[PDB]
Amino acid sequence: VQALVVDNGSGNVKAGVAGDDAPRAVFPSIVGKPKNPGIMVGMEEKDCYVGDEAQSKRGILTLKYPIEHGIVTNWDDMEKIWHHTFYNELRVAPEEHPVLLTEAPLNPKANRERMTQIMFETFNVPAMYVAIQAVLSLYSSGRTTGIVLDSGDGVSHTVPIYEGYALPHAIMRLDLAGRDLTEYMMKILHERGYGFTTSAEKEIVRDIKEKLCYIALDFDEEMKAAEDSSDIEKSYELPDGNIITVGNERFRCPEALFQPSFLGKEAAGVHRTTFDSIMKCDVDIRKDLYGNVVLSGGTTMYEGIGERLTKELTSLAPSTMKIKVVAPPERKYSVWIGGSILSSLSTFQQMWITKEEYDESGPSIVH
Amino acid sequence: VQALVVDNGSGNVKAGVAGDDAPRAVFPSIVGKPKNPGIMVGMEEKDCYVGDEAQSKRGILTLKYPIEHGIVTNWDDMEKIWHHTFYNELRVAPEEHPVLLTEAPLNPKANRERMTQIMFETFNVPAMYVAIQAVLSLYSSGRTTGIVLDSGDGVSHTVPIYEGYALPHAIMRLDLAGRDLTEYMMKILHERGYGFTTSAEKEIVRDIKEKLCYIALDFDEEMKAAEDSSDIEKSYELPDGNIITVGNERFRCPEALFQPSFLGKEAAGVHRTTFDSIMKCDVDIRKDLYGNVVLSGGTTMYEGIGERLTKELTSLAPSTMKIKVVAPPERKYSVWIGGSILSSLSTFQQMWITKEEYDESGPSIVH
Amino acid sequence: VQALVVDNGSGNVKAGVAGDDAPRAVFPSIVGKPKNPGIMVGMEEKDCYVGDEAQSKRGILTLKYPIEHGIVTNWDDMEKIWHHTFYNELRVAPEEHPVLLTEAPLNPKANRERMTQIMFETFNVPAMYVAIQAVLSLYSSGRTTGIVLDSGDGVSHTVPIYEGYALPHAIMRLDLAGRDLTEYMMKILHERGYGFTTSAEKEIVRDIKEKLCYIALDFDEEMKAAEDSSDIEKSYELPDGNIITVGNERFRCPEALFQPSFLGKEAAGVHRTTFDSIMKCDVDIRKDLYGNVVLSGGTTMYEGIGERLTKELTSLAPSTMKIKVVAPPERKYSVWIGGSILSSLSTFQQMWITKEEYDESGPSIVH
C-alpha cells in the first residue's frame, strides 16, 4: 500500500503514486459543457468533459476553471475533477490508499475544511494530510535552508525556511501568476489586430505565450533595440492554418511580473516581494537566505528569469552578499516530487489524519 | 587522577583539567530555546542548545543567561550548562575526578549550598572545593601581597591580601561589569539611528564593543578633540552585510566604569573603589598595596585601562607612593590558571570536601 | 501673539494655537500621488494631495506615510505636510508665531536637527522648542508624579517622573503600535476569505479595527466562550455596499499588545514593559508610580484596556500595592493639551530657541 500524491493547482492537476520519480498523470484543470444542441441520434452525450478530453474538443465546449487564485469557487465541478483523477487517470480505488494533498499558504480555512469533508464523505479515503507547497519544493531540492519563490497559475508566494524551522511572519503572497499574464497577452495582442475572446481562444493565447515569450535582462534597452530591427519578430501558426507574427510583445508580456503596474495592479514585483520577505527575517538568517533562492512553479520557466532575478536582488541587497538563484530543470514538478519524498518517510507515518480522528474531532482536526 | 577546574562566570564557562597551562574548553554561558515551530519532518529537535551551539544558530533561538551578577537565577538551565560542560566539552566522567569551583565574594549562602547539593547528588563527584576568584588571581601571578581588581561580566570586586593573610573587612563589591557596558552601548547607539533589541542583537553589540572600544586617558579633552575631526570614526560590518559607523561612542561606552552616573547608578568608579578598599587597611599595609595592583577579568582588557587607572590612583594617593598596576597579557584567564596551580599543590589535598563529609555534616559543611 | 502647538505623530497631525482647549485641525498624516493618467482636459491636476483631501479620493491615489516609528523617512513629503498644516489648515503666517513641536524619546539626533533646520530656513519661524510627548501628557493631567504609557501609531514608550524630576535611565521604548495592529488585522482577516492589499484597503481595515475591536479581560476563557456561541459576531459594511462579518478577530487583534509573539516579535507586552520601567526606579519611588499610571495616545482607546492592565500589574506587583490606572476620556489629545498648557506658562518664555541662537550655535543648539 503506497500513498497517493495529488498536487492540485489552479491550472493543472498532477497526480501519481508515492515512490515514483515523476507524476504519471498531468492534465489541465478544466471542466467543459457543450454550448450547442446535439442533432445526430446515435451518439453518447457524455457529461464529464474533464481535462485533456475537454481540451481536445474545445470547439463545441465552453471551458471553466473551478479554482481561482488557489481558492475553489465551484465545488460541484471540483468534485468532478477529483472523480476524474481517481477513476480515469490513476485508475485506482481511493478507499484503499491514503491521499496527500497540497494547499497554498494564507488560504481561508473553509477551503481546506470543505476539501477534507469531500474527501472523507464522498470518496471515503482511509486518511489524509494537507501540506504547504513551498515546504515541499524545499524537500525536492534536498535542503533545509533557503527561500522558495513558487509561482503557478493562480498565486505566487514566498516562504523562507531556516534550519528546518519556518518563519511564518515573513510569508508573502502575491496574486499575480500565469493566468494574469495570459490575459495581459490577450489584451496587448489587440495592438496588432489579433482578437482573442473565447475560452478556446484563451487556450490558444496560453500556448502562444508558453513558446514565444522570454524575459529580457533589462527592459528599456531591449525596447529601444526592438524598435530598430525586425529580427525579434517570430511567426506562429493558428489551428486553422492562419499565421500571425509577434514582436516586442514577446518580452513585454512577462515583464508584468517585475512591473505589476502594467496590469493596473498596485503591488510590487516578484524581486521586491522576495527582498521584503527576506528583510522580515532576523539579521543572522539573511545571509543564508540570500545564498539560496529556490525557483518553483511553471511561471518561473521563462528563459532568462534567473539572470533577471539575480540582477534585481544584487541591486537591492548589500554588495557583500552573493545572491544565488537555484533553477532546477524539473522545477515545474518540484512540489509533487517533494510530496512524494515526504510521504515515504518513516517519520511521516504519524501525521496521517485518519477517518477515526475526523469523526471524533470534526472538520477542525486539520488545524 | 587529576582534578577538574571549572571557573563559572556570568558570561563564559572556562573548564579544563588540572595541570594544563590553559583552559581547553571556553564557551559562552547561554541556553537557547527555539521561538518558532519546526515544519520539516525528518530533522532532530535537540532541546539543549548550550554554548557555541546556541551561539551559531541564534537566529531562531531566544538566548538566556542563567547567572546574573554572579548569582544563579535559573537552576534548571544551570544544570543543563554543567551537564554540557562535563559531557560534550571535557568529555569525562564527573564521578572519577574531584571538581574545583569558584565563587565571587560576598555571595548569598544558598547559592553555594545549592551548587554543592547539585554537584553531589546529580553528578556524584568524589569531592569538591569552592574558592574565591580574587585569591586565585593572586596565585596565577606568583605573589603573596597585592590588591586584586577582578571585573567580569556580572560583578566587580576588589580583595586586598597582605603576606598571605586576607583582610575580609576591606573587601568591596561593585555590581557594574561588562553586561552593563553592553546595555549602555545598546542605549547610546540609538543616537545614530541603530536599533538593537533582540537577544541576538545583544550578542552583536557585545562583539562591536569588544573590538571598537578603548579607554581615553582623559575624557573631556578627548571629547573636545573628537568633536573637531572625523578620524576617530570606524566602520563595522553586520552579519547581513550592512555597514555601520561608530564615533565617540568608542570611548564613551567604557567611561562608565569610572563614571557610573552615566548608567544612572549612584556609586563610585573602579579607581575610587580600589582606593577605598586600600584605605580600609592598616597604615603599614598600604604601601605594599599601592605598589602592586593586579588586573583580572575580561572587562579590564580595554586598551589604555592601565594608564587611566594609574593616573586616577596617583591623583588620589599621596605623592610619595609609586602606583604600579599589573596587567598580564593573559589576565582574561588568571582565575583558571590560579585554580590549576592551587589544586596541584600537595598541601591542598587536605581541603577536599569528600562526599562522606557532606553526608555527615549536611550542606553547611562548605562553611 | 500666541504660540502654535503642532503635535506631529506617525498617524495624525494635531495642530492649533496655544490657549485653545482642543486642537482645531486634526487630519491624517498621508501624502497621495495619482496612479492613473488624467484624460479629461479642463481639470486641475493638484500635486499636494495631503490629509483629508487625499483620504477623500484615495481610490485613484497611492498613499504613503512619511513618518515611520516616529522617524521621518521622507523629508520631501514631510515638508509638504508641514506646508499644508501651516497654510491650508491653520491659515496663519508661520513667521509671526513661535512653534512648539514634539518628539518621541530615544530618537536619533539627526531627525531633530533636520526638523529644526527645515523650520528655521524654509518656514522662517521666530523661535521654537521641541518637547517630549510623555512629559506633556503629564502636564495635561495636572500632576507631577506618575508613569505615563503613551501609545500611538508608530511607537509606544513609558516615561516615569517623580516630583517633577525625570528618571531617564528608566525610560523604555517598544516599537509596537497601532500600525502593527492594523497589519495584523489585515493578515488574520484572510482566515475568513477577506483579502485586503491596497493602501486604501489598509485605511478600510483601520476603520474596521477602530470600531469592532475590544480587549478581553482574559484571553483563553474568552476564546473558549467565543468558540461556543455566535453572539460575538458583528457585521460591517464596505464602501461599495458589501457586508462582512467578524468574529473572534475582534479580541484577537488587540491582544498582540500583551502578547507580541502574535506578531512574530521577540518582546514583552505593554504591562511587562510598564512593570520593568517601574522596577528600574528607586525603591522609595515605586509606591507612587504604582499608585498613578497614566494612559495616553489613541491606541489605549480600546474598551477594557484599563481593567486588563490593572489585572496584569496587580498580578506582577506585590499584594500590598494598589494599582490605579488613569484613563482620561480625552486621552487621545493629551499631548496637545499638555503642550498648550506648557507654552502658556510665564516660566517657559526663557526656553524658546530663537533664530539668533540657531545662527550662532548651529543645529546643535537644540541639545
Ligand SMILES: C/C1=C\[C@H](C)C[C@H](C)OC(=O)C[C@H](c2ccc(O)cc2)NC(=O)[C@@H](Cc2c(Br)[nH]c3ccccc23)N(C)C(=O)[C@H](C)NC(=O)[C@@H](C)C1
Ligand atoms: C487573429 C486571428 C485571426 C486573424 C484573422 C488572422 C490574420 C492573420 O489576422 C489579420 O488578418 C489581422 C486583421 C487586421 C485588421 C485590421 C488591421 O489594421 C490589422 C489587422 N485582424 C482582423 O481583421 C480582426 C478584426 C477584429 C475583430 Br472582428 N475584433 C477585433 C478586436 C481587436 C482588434 C481587431 C479585431 N479579426 C477578424 C479578428 O481578430 C478575428 C476575430 N480573430 C480570430 O478569429 C482569432 C481567433 C484568430
Ligand SMILES: C/C1=C\[C@H](C)C[C@H](C)OC(=O)C[C@H](c2ccc(O)cc2)NC(=O)[C@@H](Cc2c(Br)[nH]c3ccccc23)N(C)C(=O)[C@H](C)NC(=O)[C@@H](C)C1
Ligand atoms: C542598525 C541595523 C541596521 C541598519 C538599518 C543599517 C543601516 C546602515 O542603518 C541605517 O540606515 C540608519 C537608519 C537611520 C534612520 C533615521 C536616521 O535619522 C538615521 C539613521 N536607521 C533606521 O532606519 C532604524 C529605524 C529604527 C527603528 Br525600526 N527603531 C529604532 C530605534 C532607535 C533608532 C532608530 C530606530 N532601523 C530600521 C533599525 O535600526 C533596524 C531595526 N536595525 C536593525 O535591524 C539592526 C539589527 C541593524
Ligand SMILES: C/C1=C\[C@H](C)C[C@H](C)OC(=O)C[C@H](c2ccc(O)cc2)NC(=O)[C@@H](Cc2c(Br)[nH]c3ccccc23)N(C)C(=O)[C@H](C)NC(=O)[C@@H](C)C1
Ligand atoms: C473582502 C472584500 C470583498 C468580498 C468579496 C466581500 C464578500 C462578502 O466576501 C466574500 O464573498 C468572501 C470570499 C470567499 C471566498 C472563498 C471562501 O472560502 C470564503 C470566502 N472571498 C473572496 O472571494 C476573495 C478571494 C481572494 C482573493 Br482574489 N485573494 C485572497 C486572499 C486571501 C483570501 C481570499 C482571497 N476575494 C475576491 C477578495 O477577497 C477580494 C479581493 N476582496 C476585496 O475586494 C476587498 C477589498 C473587500
Ligand SMILES: Nc1ncnc2c1ncn2[C@@H]1O[C@H](COP(=O)(O)OP(=O)(O)O)[C@@H](O)[C@H]1O
Ligand atoms: N514552458 C513554459 N513557459 C512559460 N510558462 C509556462 C511554461 N509551462 C507552463 N507555463 C505556465 O505555468 C502556468 C501553470 O503552471 P503550474 O506550475 O503547473 O501551475 P499550477 O500550480 O496552477 O498547476 C500556466 O498558466 C502556464 O501559462
Ligand SMILES: Nc1ncnc2c1ncn2[C@@H]1O[C@H](COP(=O)(O)OP(=O)(O)O)[C@@H](O)[C@H]1O
Ligand atoms: N578584548 C576585550 N575587550 C573588551 N571587553 C572584553 C574583551 N574580551 C571580553 N570582554 C568582556 O568581558 C566580559 C566577560 O569576560 P570574563 O572575564 O570571561 O567574565 P566572566 O568572569 O563572567 O566569565 C564580556 O561581557 C565581554 O564583554
Ligand SMILES: Nc1ncnc2c1ncn2[C@@H]1O[C@H](COP(=O)(O)OP(=O)(O)O)[C@@H](O)[C@H]1O
Ligand atoms: N477609538 C479607537 N479605538 C482603537 N484605536 C484607535 C481609536 N482611535 C484611534 N485609534 C488608533 O490610534 C492610532 C493613532 O492614534 P494617535 O494617538 O493619534 O497616534 P499618533 O501619535 O501617531 O498621532 C491609529 O493608528 C488608530 O488605529
Ligand SMILES: [Mg+2]
Ligand atoms: Mg502549483
Ligand SMILES: [Mg+2]
Ligand atoms: Mg570571572
Ligand SMILES: [Mg+2]
Ligand atoms: Mg502621539
